[PDB]
Amino acid sequence: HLPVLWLESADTDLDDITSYIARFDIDAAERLWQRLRGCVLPLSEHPYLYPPSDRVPGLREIVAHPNYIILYRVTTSSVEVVNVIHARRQFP
């Protein structure tokens, strides 16, 4: 198994996205986190499962939710989550 890591920017995205939603729906915020974590955890076993990004060369794109995308890369020693972004908005 290859260790799954998170960039601080990715953690900050996580915090930003779930903060805005929670101001109106805490459970909708948790369900989104349970989905994002469920996409990133199995990367230890399938590091190259998702296609490489054409927007950001060198990264790979997970469409975890119709509105949210996880961008990650495989290094020499780990898989790093780079950013978690809104698929249609420049957010966060």
Binding site: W6, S9, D15, T18, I26, N83
Partner: protein, 45 residues
Amino acid sequence: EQENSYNEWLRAKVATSLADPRPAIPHDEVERRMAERFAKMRKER
């Protein structure tokens, strides 16, 4: 034209993410902070 602004914003966002001096964080720890955040959010209700 809205796709060009999105891609430029996203490339600049990743470029900032990759310039960050702080080291990457185990999934372990992000699960802990997410748990810390949801708990503080519920105590605020």
